Amino acid sequence: KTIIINGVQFNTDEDTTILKFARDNNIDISALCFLNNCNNDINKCEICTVEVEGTGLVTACDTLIEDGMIINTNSDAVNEKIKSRISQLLDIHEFKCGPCNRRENCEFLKLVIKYKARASKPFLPKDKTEYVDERSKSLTVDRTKCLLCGRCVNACGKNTETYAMKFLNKNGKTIIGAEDEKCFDDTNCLLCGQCIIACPVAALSEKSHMDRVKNALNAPEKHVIVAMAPSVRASIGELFNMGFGVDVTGKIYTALRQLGFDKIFDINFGADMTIMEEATELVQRIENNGPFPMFTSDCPGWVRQAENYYPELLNNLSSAKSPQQIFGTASKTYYPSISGLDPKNVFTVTVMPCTSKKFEADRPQMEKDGLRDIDAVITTRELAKMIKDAKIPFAKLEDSEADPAMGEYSGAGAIFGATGGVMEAALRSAKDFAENAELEDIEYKQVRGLNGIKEAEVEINNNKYNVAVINGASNLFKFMKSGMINEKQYHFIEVMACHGGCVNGGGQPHVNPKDLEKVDIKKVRASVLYNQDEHLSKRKSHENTALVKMYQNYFGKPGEGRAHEILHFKYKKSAWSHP
Ligand code: 402
Ligand code: SF4
Ligand code: SF4
Ligand code: SF4
Ligand code: SF4
Ligand code: FES
Ligand SMILES: [Mg+2]
Ligand SMILES: [Mg+2]
């Protein structure tokens, strides 16, 4: 097939779209609603408009190339069509970039600038109350910014297959939202925030916890603890023009101190706690010959998936709390016992690449004696803004260290952020626990990587066991519906709602679509974590010295006693009822 684009002749064999073909040959074509290899098929944005001689204006993003095509991507007719579309989008868009949360990295703004489009009449609604939905504990919607591009709808379908994000007909007009315009929390929604990640504007955002955090630091009698997730140190640098795959761990500790936090800890410590409890439980089940399989319980998106679609699996979940909640429980119990602080005055803040983490934190029973495990959860994005609002020169900061007591971590805890991380981490301890040995070879590369469903046979104390890593919520549905769960007897299964693991969470920095093709964001972010694991001296959660002292002096033996009493959490299926 022979193609000519802007006068340049091409003789290729590729079967693909005009748009794909163009980008592969450094030919510029704008796009808006095209993402994840799909566009808005019932309301095409037409930003990708090109002209095919002998046919007219077409959409490049979903039109295949064809021998004999003469294509003009930059004619006046093309640009005025594109300009017209952007102008009409402006007609329903509160174009006030000043206090906007996507103002530094908005796709729509870049399009408005590129084509110099203006609205026929600006959209300045008086009362945004009717446009804003902040009911949810994890997500919020601002429909003054919504372009109706359907990227959230498509991403939810592709990433989770729940189709929790829908087009709705509100009073005769089209919006996006949850089923019957309910609060997402009350629907089958996983609160994974993959919809936010797909959004080209500030229409979708996390539920802000920043006021919680600010009030706590300004409150005289509050002792504010902060602890970031594995993934944060591997990605927050992106929002400070530092590039991708940059370890900024030390800079973060410094930034957090300058922000005024009273204690600097780390969720990787909690991750090591989770392994202590979860490896112990697995070994218990190995020698009780069940119940099998045990599922991980550290992903609140997956927890909600189970609660909403597979409640019969709830009893198979590990009782161990997530690194966030298990750290939190210790922060109100253990940490006062070694600091002299009144438990009531402790305010525990986590930094997460996750929106679902907010819902997990505000679960009614995630507390004891009136004290929440976790009082506030801010996303990676929220922390970035916080650092910028404080005008802290992040890229120029010098490295500091976390406070040891609940800040030290092993290599096992560090790789939690990647898909298969919990699996590898857990196996390192469980094998040592069951074999009563200090084992040399601890790398389980078979459970790593971006394959959606990953399996492996492991041999623990002279017995072969089957494990599986489920990489993404859509892949959970696949694994269960396809009957893969019954093809063999699995013993330990990891499930992460976000493909790639937490490094690809809904609270992570947005990445521009062109950069997404440019850089494998899931593997590059996770590489930071694995590199830490490789160069840490302690690579097993039970070799965490600060953790070992904690169990020795306070909790005792994991899996039983006081440790099982307050560090665990069990999910309950609803009893049978009609109707
Ligand atoms: N809690 C917890 Fe986890 C840990 O440690 C984070 O903390 Fe994750 C990350 N990064 C997130 O958010 S959650 C599911 N387990 C994998 S990693
Ligand atoms: S969504 Fe983008 S274009 Fe709209 S106000 Fe925010 S930054 Fe500006
Ligand atoms: S939070 Fe996740 S499950 Fe809910 S609508 Fe968004 S993408 Fe779908
Ligand atoms: S919420 Fe964002 S991604 Fe979804 S339709 Fe509106 S602008 Fe597009
Ligand atoms: S994979 Fe990580 S970021 Fe995504 S929903 Fe689960 S815990 Fe949250
Ligand atoms: S990007 Fe092609 S129609 Fe939207
Ligand atoms: Mg399509
Ligand atoms: Mg304070």
Author numbering: 2 to 580
Give verbatim excerpts from the published study on this entry.
[FeFe]-hydrogenases represent one of natures’ most effective classes of redox enzymes catalyzing the reversible reduction of protons to dihydrogen (H2) at turnover frequencies of up to 9000 s-11–3. With their low catalytic over-potential, [FeFe]-hydrogenases represent excellent models for a regenerative and likewise economically feasible H2 production. Their active center (“H-cluster”) can be structured into a standard [4Fe-4S]-cluster ([4Fe]H) and a diiron site ([2Fe]H). Theoretical studies suggest that the most probable PT pathway comprises of strictly conserved residues E282, S319, E279, and C299 (from surface to H-cluster, numbering corresponds to CpI), including two protein-bound water molecules (Wat826, Wat1120 4XDC19, chain B) located between E279 and C29915,16,20. In this study, site-directed mutagenesis (SDM) is used to investigate the PT pathway of two [FeFe]-hydrogenases, namely CpI and HydA1, which represent the largest (M3) and smallest (M1) type of monomeric [FeFe]-hydrogenases, respectively.
Corresponding to earlier crystal structure data, for all CpI variants a space group of P1 21 1 was observed with two copies in the asymmetric unit cell (chain A and B). In case of C299DCpI, the carboxyl group of the side chain establishes H-bonds (2.7 Å) with the amine group of [2Fe]H and the “conserved” water molecule Wat708 (corresponding to Wat826 in chain B of 4XDC19). Unsurprisingly, protein samples of C169DHydA1 and C299DCpI both retain a rather high level of H2 release activity (30–80%). The favorable position of the acidic asparagine side chain in the structure of C299DCpI effectively connects adt-NH of the [2Fe]H moiety with the conserved water molecule Wat708 in the otherwise intact PT pathway, rendering this variant significantly active. This comparatively high level of absolute activity and the fact that both corresponding variants, C169DHydA1 and C299DCpI, exhibit significant shifts in their pH-dependent activity optimum to the acidic range might explain why this type of variant refuses to accumulate Hhyd even at pH 4, while instead effectively continuing the turnover process as evident according to the comparatively dominant infrared bands for the reduced states Hred and Hsred (1890 and 1882 cm−1 for C169D) recorded at pH 4. With the exception of S189AHydA1/S319ACpI, these variants retain a higher level of H2-release activity, which explains why in these cases Hhyd cannot be trapped at pH 8; just as wild-type enzyme, these variants populate Hhyd when titrated to significantly lower pH values. Interestingly, variant C169D and the corresponding variant of CpI (C299D) seem to be incapable of accumulating Hhyd under any of the conditions applied here. The strongest impacts were achieved when replacing E279CpI for A or Q, or C299CpI for A or S, resulting in activities <1%.
